Amino acid sequence: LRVAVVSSSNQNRSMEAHNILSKRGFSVRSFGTGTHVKLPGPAPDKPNVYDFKTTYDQMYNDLLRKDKELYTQNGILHMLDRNKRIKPRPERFQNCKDLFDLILTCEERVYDQVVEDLNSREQETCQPVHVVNVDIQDNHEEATLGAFLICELCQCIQHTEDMENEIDELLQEFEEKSGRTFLHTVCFY
């Protein structure tokens, strides 16, 4: 099962999922659909802002020299180190050309950006890819709980005979067990 997990900045929700899925033997890539990268700052209204070209290591260093103590206490330096250990930089979904069975998005806005983008690429093959959303709030604890939920869903899917025929029924069971809604659509390669 080839999965892509997509958030806004490719920093937290998708990287937490990337990490769990990867360690659990899934084939997984992660992306963000945001215009730029956003990281928490010293007040909820003053985030740090970066270009998608910027490396996790460059963000780490920039934050280290800004306020070492703040970005230690808020888990961000450790997050960026964790991310550096998976890959060198955040990846923008709109710039990749890879094939997945399943694309999971971490909030509705990201799901709209994934759908808008895939729906605007010319289909060559008409092979479907399933796109599923779950709303996960952008903080560490939610990213972690959401990553486990996503891992559980992926595992269910690994286990079904016929993914396309059973996936809706599975999502409905997940809605019921989690109380969280799961939007679901297909796009075409």
Binding site: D112, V115, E116, N119, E122, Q123, E124, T125, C126, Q127, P128, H130, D162, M163, E164, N165, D168, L171, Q172, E175, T181, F182, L183, H184, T185, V186, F188
Partner: protein, 317 residues
């Protein structure tokens, strides 16, 4: 490849085919893809010679092996469409595989081959009794895929919708306002079929294209239609509308019908997913220059779905 430059391609092919026989897992596909590349692209004069050796893998127990064989049939027929004479039977038998992933791959391959076969028929100087029968086979297989819209399997229905979409577009003419994918510039379409062709009848194909569209419009108002099949059909209609704007009328009508009669069996999140796709496709049709004639209706639907005015404007000319 060590000493490759000293080998003939045919020798290399036989070596690789025997190698593939030695291997008892999916990595044999890597070998068989090297064979494919050599007898389709490096030296296609070897394609006929080795065809049976590749096609023999259609009986392999591996799902991925049989999918590989379907892809090979696809490439072999694009290289040399006359091979359909001896491969249409195999492709139709693979449409009928016990495994749904093999079935689905066969549907996508027919979606590529039907139009290649029809071009072949249109271009053919002379036409044999065998080539007529081969066209009967392709055409009956197209009919079988249209019937897969009534499959009990959701993934097969989704693939059948995509085949049906391609068929409607092939069997209707390009027009001044057709928005044509770059890849497809030289694909055959109705307007390219001479009215006086000795075998392929323009009028018959026109009627099949319309009947294919009717089947799809009927499917869409089926009470049990699944969330994925309905979103697939919505996107198929938007593609059709943009490539063949004489059907834009039919598409807007379907969209209005769906908007006023949402299929009651859709769960809450399914209704939302569909509604979000309805809005996406309406905006997509609005951007198309031929949507001039439908703009008030499209705008009304979009306002009903909660689209802000500023977003509607952003999608106007």
């Amino acid at each position: 490849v060590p000493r490759g430059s000293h080998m003939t391609t045919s020798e290399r092919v036989v070596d690789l085919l025997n190698q593939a026989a030695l291997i008892t897992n999916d990595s044999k596909i890597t070998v068989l893809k090297q064979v494919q590349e050599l007898i389709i692209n490096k030296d296609p004069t070897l394609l006929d010679n080795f065809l049976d050796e590749i096609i023999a893998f259609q009986a392999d127990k591996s799902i991925e092996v049989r999918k590989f064989v379907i892809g090979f049939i696809e490439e072999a027929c694009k290289r040399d469409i006359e091979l359909l004479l001896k491969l249409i039977a195999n492709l139709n038998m693979l449409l009928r595989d016990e495994n749904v992933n093999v079935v689905k791959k066969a549907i996508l391959t027919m979606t590529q081959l039907y139009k290649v076969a029809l071009q072949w028929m249109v271009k053919s100087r002379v036409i044999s009794e065998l080539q007529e029968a081969c066209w009967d086979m392709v055409s009956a297989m197209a009919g079988d895929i249209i019937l897969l819209l009534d499959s009990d399997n959701d993934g097969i229905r989704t693939h059948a919708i995509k085949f049906v979409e391609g068929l409607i577009v092939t069997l209707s003419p390009r027009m001044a306002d057709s928005e044509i994918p770059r890849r497809q510039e030289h694909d055959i379409s109705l307007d390219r079929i001479p009215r006086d062709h000795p075998y392929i009848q323009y009028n018959v194909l026109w009627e099949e294209g319309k009947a294919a569209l009717e089947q799809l419009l009927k499917f869409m108002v089926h009470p049990a239609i699944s969330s994925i099949n309905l979103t697939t059909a919505l996107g198929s209609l938007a593609n059709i509308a943009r490539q063949r704007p004489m059907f834009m009328s039919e598409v807007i009508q379907a969209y209005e019908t769906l908007h006023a009669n949402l299929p009651p069996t859709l769960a809450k999140s399914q209704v939302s997913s569909v509604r979000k796709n309805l809005k996406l496709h309406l905006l997509s049709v609005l951007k198309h220059p031929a949507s001039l004639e439908f703009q008030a209706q499209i705008t009304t639907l979009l306002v009903d779905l909660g689209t802000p005015q500023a977003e509607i404007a952003r999608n106007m000319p």
